[PDB]
């Protein structure tokens, strides 16, 4: 629900989620990077 929940998940965990493609993972990284955040903090 929150950005703080998303930032704790690893890239390998997000790829296990249902309806989660490589394209949507790249979108999430690019958007988090635009805000100075990274996956796995």
């Amino acid at each position: 629900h929150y950005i703080g929940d998303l930032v704790q998940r690893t890239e390998v965990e997000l790829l296990k989620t249902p309806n989660l493609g490589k394209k949507s993972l790249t979108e999430i990284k690019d958007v988090l990077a635009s805000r100075g955040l990274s996956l796995g903090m």
């Binding site: 790829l15 296990k16 249902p18 309806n19 989660l20 493609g21 490589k22 394209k23 949507s24």
Partner: protein
């Protein structure tokens, strides 16, 4: 070719070279080229049909993901998911309408396909 009695690509591919050389205007190089084209056409038709349904191309590529039966591979290929890469690129939502595929089973197959394509 039709006036000389050839009606199928199979006849042109497999008939004895002597019968094709009896046709007026065919030389040995042109008969060899015609047979090679007929065999390549038959191979392209066989590959095309095998990718459209689940005969060989999708029965090996799309069916690489552990769990894919031949019926599911043909259902995937009917949606344009012909290869193990095409399946690795799908979401669960893109496969949700396939009769006999639960969201959990779709998720497991996509993850198996990704493990082979992206982490093998």
């Amino acid at each position: 070719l039709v006036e000389e009695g050839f009606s199928t690509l199979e006849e042109l591919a497999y008939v004895p070279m002597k019968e094709l050389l009896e046709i007026e205007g065919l030389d040995e190089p042109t008969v060899e080229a015609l047979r090679e084209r007929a065999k390549n056409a038959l191979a392209t038709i066989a590959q095309a049909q095998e990718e459209s349904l689940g005969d060989n191309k999708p029965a090996d590529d799309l069916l690489n993901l552990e769990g894919v039966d031949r019926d599911l591979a043909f259902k995937l290929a009917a949606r344009g998911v012909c290869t193990l890469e095409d399946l690795a690129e799908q979401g669960i939502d893109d496969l949700a309408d396939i009769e006999g595929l639960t969201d959990e089973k779709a998720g497991a197959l996509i993850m198996a396909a990704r493990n082979i394509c992206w982490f093998g």
